[PDB]
């Protein structure tokens, strides 16, 4: 399902990257960045964004984007709810969902991403 | 960092691997460092094994040849006593795309699927995913493995097993045809993501293998019912999409309570829910009628969330509530959200078409609205009235005269075209201002937008056909200006329009008909909500959201005339 | 004319900040963050020449840097300084810390900041390149340590 | 100092509170009689300034630390003093007695720390008050004092020109200092003087020639050589005298950086000298060879600046640069985007009537390998720029050009779709012998417009579809399946494209109707003409119902017209000629 994750900061850079299967280039997020350029603010980006070979299912909370990569047809709410669940677990372990906490505990972030998602199907 | 890993100190290796994982998260290239990492894959420290396997999972497809050099190590890792190690080793083996790894991968998947630990079983389902993505020609024995997996009682495996079945063999319905009972009974206890996947597949299966509402067809509905209260948005939407596509129309309305409840959730959750509910409301209006007030726009929601709420309100408009909505639309028009303000202006016209009895009342809201100082509101207000004025081709002088005076202060290209178009149709109804409008635009033609230019030739021809006694020079002026325009579209129209109008020397039978075709009464536009196109798509799926058949769409069939043999399915 | 010397790790936490233009402390901090965000975003195979930001006096200046281990060594210079000249200056600088600190690391830049300012002053003086002969440089700092020992 | 380091490291989230407490403690400590505690607090406060806290509050305490007779506290005080006072700090005036005491002292290293402090004390008042003594310190006996002192001059010169007037001959005689470090520092100062008013140093060129003949320490040569590049605009003749030592240096260069600096500077020198003396092509050849040796090296910085120098000489002498070819084509694959963009500019530079095809083939292999809608956009824009420069001057096989345009059409997600469409239209109308291939390719894409319809965004694939529709309708005479192409263009899948695309689609569908009706009536196939007309009458209403303005207008008028044409055909009317004349 959810194929790769691209946490994106407020300024418009690739804050964090994770891949579960064959790696998609970071050039997949330029469509999202173009959408943000078209969007009035951070609240006007559609959760599902189409790319020529992938689909970007993204959520925005705690001043941070959770951009996931989708290749095959998937329930959009499946991926959106999974992103919000991973954000909730991020907040639970960190105590607050913030750029600095993730930047400091990248290793625990990767451990949590691997624990939550196993080869495309979220399960714990 | 290479020498740091080559050190016999395990803590040094751990620190180096943590740094490597960090720079991977940064996205930098660590493929050069693969020769050092592959050396300690057989280390006895569990943490270093986990980090090393993360690195191997990330860079196994990059440095494929060194992984080829160390396949036997992965073979030995497949027998590791700790389950996560077996899963990771099978994952790394599946990551290799060399056309030779195939039979080893096949034996690996067979052993994993036969092994007792459920975690490696779901990882083996993902392994057959990967192999089918790699070698499609093994699908017979892949399907055999899937048949073996689907019989497993564990739900943790069951979700991933269903997904593997579906992407590998979506057509071999018989395997799920056998364990319909097991899957439906486990659907209460299956984990939520597995619940979503199983519910989508069961909706497709029920659409294929049943006729109009069979005890088994009710068995799906009987056990899917308790999930409508689930906290997961995907689960409830999956159940709601199940009821819409499977349940009788007399019972499927029960989902409108839970679907509306989801609108209290986050922005992203309700963006899809509003998109689905918009399509549901078109075909069956009465189910969402009692919750009309729950779809009233709040100013806190963003433009795209509010706009979808507007589209639901349009589809729910009826003569018993059109007046209530029309008053509410007037509230939203002067909102500070210019993008949303345009949408509500569009909403009024759509409700005016749906409710034919309030066409005059809807106009009165808009014609007086034409005096607003906002440049965008007047831009779309004249567009929407144009549709309403087109629908009733009556001499609505109290409206059209207002626009013609306004046109001198309109800059938006679409709005300028709409004003020029209404003037062209009603040239005989306004024979005193229409000639001056063309004269105003002819001077400014060179600076107009490409879309606006087209309507001036349309205006220029229409005025010529009725009042050539005095606009013949104006028409020739504007046609000559468009003849040399940069965009070839205008050069195409000018070539066509001039040919139809000017050359009376070659006035054949078709040219004497020219006044008829341009001045022909324009049929009302069958304006369609941007959600009726979703009638061809399953609710709750990606293809429904994009309105395009996404790669791997699992198309629903039509209800079969006769039900396939229920006695086989036991 | 070296505008300022900025040294920080891969996390942006400062290790050295020596300015040769009168800038306020808040301006110095936002300058450090700006150069860190400009530099660390590029991977190892990217060139080491970034056009200067607006906080260091405009685009006339440039951000020249090198990466060792997890440390960044950025020199703010204008269009008049040699790109690889400043690069080699950084190289001699880092080697000077290596042998003055006996295999320097980030920890020495953290706990021995004053000695690192001393190294910079012996190497670069007020935006002027003072000494480039490495051996004489280390010899002079060692002599300074001798007079610390003697008194 | 390390105690505060440990406290800050432990107090990560509580940095503000712990720093405030430490600031209060530093306030208490800096008012003590013991200068050692004050110096420790000054170490703390220098760390504080690096962290980003105001240093100006304890300038007087820093002075008090500096006033200590022990040089151990003197160095810390001077460091914080260099980092402490600014132009608006009148508190620096209390430093004067200690500054004079340390400056007039004969001790070499105490004077060294004093000069290190003074390097940031450079104000017009302090410069005016201390230039008299530091001018005497110019010729101080011990070398190290002079070695820092000349830089302290450079500061004063910047701030006190009234000492610059008489001390300029002093620096001129300083240029011959026997101690290598001292002379090198003097050179650095004199170059940074010459960089501002280069006219007053052209007469000083022979001293610099003697310097570069005698100098061995590379950085000295780098600085003087860049300044030699600097004066070449003012006097090309010093470059004429200097090219021979330039060439000797490049042949003797062992440092890659110094090598780059010399080769770039000789590019500048030869640019200056080419004005009336076009006989330096041998020097040009050698500098291109040196640039090649520079760029082949694997370190990306060396390669980048070497490539920049080749770019400059391409503006200068591209006749030798054009031979690089494969070299630049390999440097195209580097992972840095900036070097790739510079390489693309070089490809633009050397694209010629002989090698445009090969360069574009490699560029399009890369664009297939390229990632990033921004990068993909600039790459395709550059491809169109190098193909379309001077009205398609350097392209001979236009069929290949249409082929590469169609290959670019595969780049779904491009924001330059309108540029591609304009290129296809321009090449189709401008050149006639390739209209057949253009029509064939575009009609093939129209048959696949059900696939190209996946991108309905503006400036996307829909503009490609617009170009296809225009050049098939206008040039329908070269079509092989006009009935098939008009059926494909009237397909219901079209009904989801933006306004003007559908509008031009319909306006050319009627053109195809004219052409096919002409063909069928000329051969006498009345039944086929009736079939085509009834097909269009059954398809245009699908577009008349559209809500967008111009497409609806076009569809409605054209549908009414086609109904009337059918009415005439029921009356046995040769309507084909007039329908063709509508679009002739």
Swiss-Prot record, chain A:
Superkingdom per UniProt: Eukaryota
Entry's localization field: Golgi apparatus; Cytoplasmic vesicle membrane
Family assignment from sequence similarity: Belongs to the adaptor complexes medium subunit family.
Function according to Swiss-Prot or TrEMBL: Part of the AP-3 complex, an adaptor-related complex which is not clathrin-associated. The complex is associated with the Golgi region as well as more peripheral structures. It facilitates the budding of vesicles from the Golgi membrane and may be directly involved in trafficking to lysosomes. In concert with the BLOC-1 complex, AP-3 is required to target cargos into vesicles assembled at cell bodies for delivery into neurites and nerve terminals.
Subunit structure: Adaptor protein complex 3 (AP-3) is a heterotetramer composed of two large adaptins (delta-type subunit AP3D1 and beta-type subunit AP3B1 or AP3B2), a medium adaptin (mu-type subunit AP3M1 or AP3M2) and a small adaptin (sigma-type subunit APS1 or AP3S2). Interacts with AGAP1. AP-3 associates with the BLOC-1 complex.
Protein name: AP-3 complex subunit mu-1
From Swiss-Prot, chain B:
GO cellular component: AP-3 adaptor complex; axon cytoplasm; clathrin adaptor complex; clathrin-coated vesicle membrane; early endosome; Golgi apparatus; lysosomal membrane; membrane
GO biological process entries: anterograde axonal transport; anterograde synaptic vesicle transport; antigen processing and presentation, exogenous lipid antigen via MHC class Ib; blood coagulation; cell morphogenesis; clathrin-coated vesicle cargo loading, AP-3-mediated; establishment of protein localization to mitochondrial membrane involved in mitochondrial fission; granulocyte differentiation
This protein's UniProt keywords: Albinism, Cytoplasmic vesicle, Disease variant, Golgi apparatus, Hermansky-Pudlak syndrome, Membrane, Phosphoprotein, Protein transport, Transport
UniProt disease link: Hermansky-Pudlak syndrome 2: A form of Hermansky-Pudlak syndrome, a genetically heterogeneous autosomal recessive disorder characterized by oculocutaneous albinism, bleeding due to platelet storage pool deficiency, and lysosomal storage defects. This syndrome results from defects of diverse cytoplasmic organelles including melanosomes, platelet dense granules and lysosomes. Ceroid storage in the lungs is associated with pulmonary fibrosis, a common cause of premature death in individuals with HPS.
Family the entry assigns: Belongs to the adaptor complexes large subunit family.
Organism: Homo sapiens
UniProtKB/Swiss-Prot annotation, chain C:
Keywords, in A-Z order: Cytoplasmic vesicle, Golgi apparatus, Membrane, Phosphoprotein, Protein transport, Transport
Gene Ontology cellular component terms for the protein in this record: AP-3 adaptor complex; AP-type membrane coat adaptor complex; axon cytoplasm; cytoplasmic vesicle membrane; early endosome; Golgi apparatus; intracellular membrane-bounded organelle; presynapse
Coiled-coil stretches: none
GO biological process per UniProt: anterograde axonal transport; anterograde synaptic vesicle transport; clathrin-coated vesicle cargo loading, AP-3-mediated; Golgi to vacuole transport; insulin receptor signaling pathway; intracellular protein transport; intracellular transport; melanosome assembly
Protein name: AP-3 complex subunit sigma-1
Expressed in which tissues: Present in all adult tissues examined.
Subunit structure: Adaptor protein complex 3 (AP-3) is a heterotetramer composed of two large adaptins (delta-type subunit AP3D1 and beta-type subunit AP3B1 or AP3B2), a medium adaptin (mu-type subunit AP3M1 or AP3M2) and a small adaptin (sigma-type subunit APS1 or AP3S2). Interacts with AGAP1. AP-3 associates with the BLOC-1 complex.
Localization per record: Golgi apparatus; Cytoplasmic vesicle membrane
Top-level taxon: Eukaryota
Organism expressing this protein natively: Homo sapiens (Human)
Main location: Golgi
Family the UniProt entry places it in: Belongs to the adaptor complexes small subunit family.
Membrane-topology descriptor: Peripheral membrane protein
Curated annotation (Swiss-Prot), chain D:
Compartments, record wording: Cytoplasm; Golgi apparatus membrane
UniProt entry tagged with the keyword Phosphoprotein: yes
Positions annotated as HEAT repeat: 17-54, 60-97, 125-162, 163-199, 237-275, 282-319, 321-356, 358-392, 414-451, 480-518, 531-568
Topology versus the membrane: Peripheral membrane protein
GO CC annotation terms, alphabetical: AP-3 adaptor complex; axon cytoplasm; early endosome; endosome membrane; glutamatergic synapse; Golgi apparatus; Golgi membrane; lysosomal membrane
Keyword Protein transport: yes
Source species, domain of life: Eukaryota
Tissue: Present in all adult tissues examined with the highest levels in skeletal muscle, heart, pancreas and testis.
Keywords: Acetylation, Albinism, Coiled coil, Cytoplasm, Golgi apparatus, Hermansky-Pudlak syndrome, Membrane, Phosphoprotein, Protein transport, Repeat, Transport
GO process annotations (BP): anterograde axonal transport; anterograde synaptic vesicle transport; antigen processing and presentation, exogenous lipid antigen via MHC class Ib; clathrin-coated vesicle cargo loading, AP-3-mediated; endosome to melanosome transport; Golgi to vacuole transport; intracellular protein transport; intracellular transport
Primary localisation category: cytoplasm
Homology family: Belongs to the adaptor complexes large subunit family.
Name listed for the protein in its UniProt record: AP-3 complex subunit delta-1
Organism: Homo sapiens
Portion of the parent chain present: 18 to 601 of 1153
């Amino acid at each position: 399902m959810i194929h790769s994750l691209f946490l994106i900061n407020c300024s418009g850079d690739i804050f964090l990257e994770k891949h579960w299967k064959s790696v998609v280039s970071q050039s997949v997020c330029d469509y999202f960045f173009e959408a943000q350029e078209k969007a009035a603010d951070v609240e006007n980006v559609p959760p599902v964004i189409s790319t020529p070979h992938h689909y970007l299912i993204s959520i925005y909370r705690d001043k941070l984007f959770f951009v996931s990569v989708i290749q095959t047809e998937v329930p959009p709410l499946f991926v959106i709810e999974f992103l919000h669940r991973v954000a909730d677990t991020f907040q639970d372990y960190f105590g607050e969902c913030s750029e600095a906490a993730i930047k400091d505990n990248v290793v625990i972030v990767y451990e949590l991403l691997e624990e939550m998602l196993d080869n495309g199907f979220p399960l714990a | 960092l290479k020498q740091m890993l080559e050190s016999n100190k395990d803590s040094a290796k751990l620190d180096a691997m943590k740094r490597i994982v960090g720079m991977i998260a940064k996205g930098k290239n660590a493929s050069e460092l693969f020769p050092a990492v592959v050396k300690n894959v057989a280390s006895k420290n569990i943490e270093i094994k986990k980090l090393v396997y993360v690195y191997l999972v990330r860079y196994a497809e990059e440095q494929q040849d060194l992984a080829l050099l160390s396949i036997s190590t992965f073979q030995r890792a497949l027998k590791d006593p700790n389950q996560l190690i077996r899963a990771s080793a099978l994952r790394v083996l599946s990551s290799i795309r060399v056309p030779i790894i195939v039979p080893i991968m096949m034996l690996a998947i067979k052993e994993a699927s036969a092994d007792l630990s459920p975690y490696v079983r779901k990882n083996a389902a993902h392994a057959i995913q990967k192999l089918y993505s790699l070698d499609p020609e093994q699908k017979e024995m892949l399907i055999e493995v899937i048949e073996k997996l689907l019989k497993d009682k564990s739900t943790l495996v069951a979700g991933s097993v269903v997904m593997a079945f579906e992407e590998v063999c979506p057509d071999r319905i018989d395997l799920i045809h056998k364990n319909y009972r097991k899957l439906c009974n486990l659907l209460v206890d299956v984990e939520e993501w597995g619940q979503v996947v199983i519910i989508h597949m069961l909706t497709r299966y029920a659409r294929t293998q049943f006729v109009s509402p069979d005890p088994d067809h009710r068995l799906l509905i009987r056990n899917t019912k308790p999930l409508l209260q689930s906290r997961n948005a995907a689960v409830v939407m999956a159940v709601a999409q199940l009821y819409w596509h499977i349940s009788p129309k007399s019972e499927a309305g029960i989902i409108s309570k839970s679907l509306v409840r989801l609108l209290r959730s986050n922005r992203e959750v309700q963006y899809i829910v509003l998109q689905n509910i918009a399509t549901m409301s078109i075909q069956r209006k009465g189910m969402f009628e009692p919750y009309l007030k729950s779809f009233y726009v709040r100013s806190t929601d963003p433009t795209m969330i509010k706009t979808l709420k507007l589209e639901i309100l349009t589809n729910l408009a009826n003569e018993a509530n059109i007046s209530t909505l029309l008053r509410e639309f007037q509230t939203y028009v002067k909102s500070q959200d210019k993008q949303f303000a345009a949408a509500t202006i569009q909403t009024i016209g759509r409700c005016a078409t749906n409710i034919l009895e309030v066409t005059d009342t809807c106009l009165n809201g808009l014609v007086c609205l034409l005096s607003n100082r906002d440049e965008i509101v007047v831009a779309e207000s004249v567009v929407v009235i144009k549709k309403l004025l087109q629908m009733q081709p009556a001499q609505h002088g109290e409206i059209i005269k207002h626009m013609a005076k306004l046109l001198d202060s309109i800059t938006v290209p679409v709005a300028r075209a709409s004003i020029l178009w209404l003037i062209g149709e009603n040239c005989e109804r306004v024979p005193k201002i229409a000639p001056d409008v063309l004269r105003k635009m002819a001077k400014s033609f060179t600076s107009e937008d490409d879309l606006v230019k087209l309507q001036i030739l349309n205006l220029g021809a229409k005025l010529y056909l009725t009042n050539s006694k005095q606009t013949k020079l104006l028409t020739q002026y504007i046609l000559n200006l468009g003849k040399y325009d940069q965009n070839y579209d205008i050069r195409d129209r000018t070539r066509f329009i001039r040919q139809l109008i000017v050359p009376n020397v070659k006035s054949g039978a078709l040219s004497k008909y020219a006044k008829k075709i341009f001045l022909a009464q324009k049929p009302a536009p069958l304006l369609e909500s941007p959600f009726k196109d979703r009638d061809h798509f399953q609710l709750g799926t990606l293809s429904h959201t994009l309105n395009i058949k996404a790669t791997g769409y699992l198309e629903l069939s039509n209800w079969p005339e006769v039900a396939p043999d229920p006695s086989v399915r036991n | 004319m070296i505008k300022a010397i900025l040294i920080f790790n891969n996390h942006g936490k400062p290790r050295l900040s020596k300015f040769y233009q009168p800038y306020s402390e808040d301006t110095q901090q936002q300058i450090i963050r700006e150069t860190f965000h400009l530099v660390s975003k590029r991977d190892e195979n990217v060139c080491n020449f970034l056009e200067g930001g607006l906080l260091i006096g405009g685009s006339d200046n440039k951000l020249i840097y090198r990466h060792y281990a997890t440390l960044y060594f950025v020199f703010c210079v204008d269009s008049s300084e040699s790109e690889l000249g400043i690069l080699d200056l950084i190289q001699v600088f880092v080697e000077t810390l290596d042998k003055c600190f006996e295999n320097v690391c980030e920890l020495d830049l953290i706990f021995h900041v004053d000695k690192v300012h001393n190294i910079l002053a012996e190497m670069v003086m007020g935006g002027m390149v003072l000494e480039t002969n490495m051996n004489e440089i280390v010899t002079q700092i060692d002599a300074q340590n001798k007079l610390e020992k003697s008194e | 100092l390390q105690d505060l380091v440990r406290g800050i490291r432990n107090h990560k989230e509580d940095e503000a509170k712990y720093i405030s407490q430490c600031i209060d403690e530093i306030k208490q400590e800096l008012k003590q009689d013991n200068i050692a505690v004050k110096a420790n607090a000054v170490c703390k406060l220098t760390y504080l300034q690096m962290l980003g806290y105001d240093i100006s509050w304890a300038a007087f305490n820093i002075i008090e630390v500096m006033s200590a007779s022990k040089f151990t506290f003197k160095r810390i005080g001077y460091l914080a003093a260099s980092q402490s006072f600014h132009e608006g700090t009148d508190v620096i005036m209390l430093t004067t007695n200690q500054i004079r005491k340390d400056l007039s002292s004969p001790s070499q290293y105490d004077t060294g720390v004093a000069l290190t402090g003074l390097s940031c004390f450079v104000t017009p008042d302090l410069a005016r008050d201390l230039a008299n003594d530091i001018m005497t310190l110019m010729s101080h006996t011990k070398p190290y004092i002079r070695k820092k002192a000349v830089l302290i001059m450079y500061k004063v010169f910047l701030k006190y020109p009234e000492s610059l007037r008489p001390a300029f001959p002093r620096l001129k005689e300083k240029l011959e200092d026997p101690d290598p470090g001292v002379q090198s520092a003097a050179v650095n100062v004199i170059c940074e003087l010459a960089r501002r008013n280069p006219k007053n140093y052209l007469s000083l060129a022979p001293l610099f020639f003697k310097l570069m003949t005698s100098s061995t320490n590379n950085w000295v040569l780098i600085k003087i050589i860049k300044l030699f590049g600097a004066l070449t605009p003012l006097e090309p003749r010093l470059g004429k005298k200097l090219i021979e030592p330039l060439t000797n240096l490049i042949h003797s260069t062992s440092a890659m950086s110094l090598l780059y600096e010399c080769v770039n500077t000789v590019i500048a020198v030869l640019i200056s000298l080419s004005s009336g003396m076009p006989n330096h092509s041998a020097s040009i050849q050698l500098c291109v060879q040196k640039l090649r040796i520079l760029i082949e090296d694997s370190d990306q910085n060396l390669k980048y600046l070497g490539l920049l120098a080749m770019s400059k000489i391409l503006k200068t002498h591209p006749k030798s640069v054009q031979s690089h070819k494969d070299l630049i084509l390999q440097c195209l694959d580097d992972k840095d985007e900036s070097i790739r963009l510079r390489a693309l500019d070089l490809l633009y530079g050397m694209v010629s009537k002989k090698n445009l095809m090969e360069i574009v083939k490699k560029l399009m292999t890369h664009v297939d390998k390229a990632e990033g809608t921004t990068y993909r956009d600039e790459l395709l824009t550059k491809i169109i720029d190098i193909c379309s420069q001077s009205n398609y001057q350097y392209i001979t096989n236009f069929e290949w050009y249409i082929s590469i345009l169609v290959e670019l059409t595969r780049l779904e997600g491009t924001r330059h779709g309108h540029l591609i469409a304009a290129q296809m239209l321009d090449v189709a109308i401008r050149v006639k012998a390739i209209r057949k291939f253009a029509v064939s390719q575009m009609s093939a894409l129209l048959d696949s417009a059900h696939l190209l319809a996946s991108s309905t965004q503006r400036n996307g694939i829909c503009e490609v579809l617009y170009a296809a529709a225009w050049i098939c309708g206008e040039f329908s005479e070269h079509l092989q399946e006009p009935h098939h192409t008009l059926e494909a263009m009237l397909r219901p899948r079209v009904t989801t494209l933006p306004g003007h695309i559908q509008a031009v689609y319909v306006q050319n569908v009627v053109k195809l109707y004219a052409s096919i009706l002409q063909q069928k009536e000329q051969a006498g196939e009345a039944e086929g003409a009736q079939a085509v007309t009834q097909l269009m009458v059954d398809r245009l209403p699908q577009f008349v119902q559209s809500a967008d303005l111009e497409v609806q207008e076009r569809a409605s008028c054209i549908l009414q017209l086609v109904k009337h044409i059918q009415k005439l055909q029921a009356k046995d009317v040769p309507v084909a000629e007039e329908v063709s004349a509508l679009f002739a």
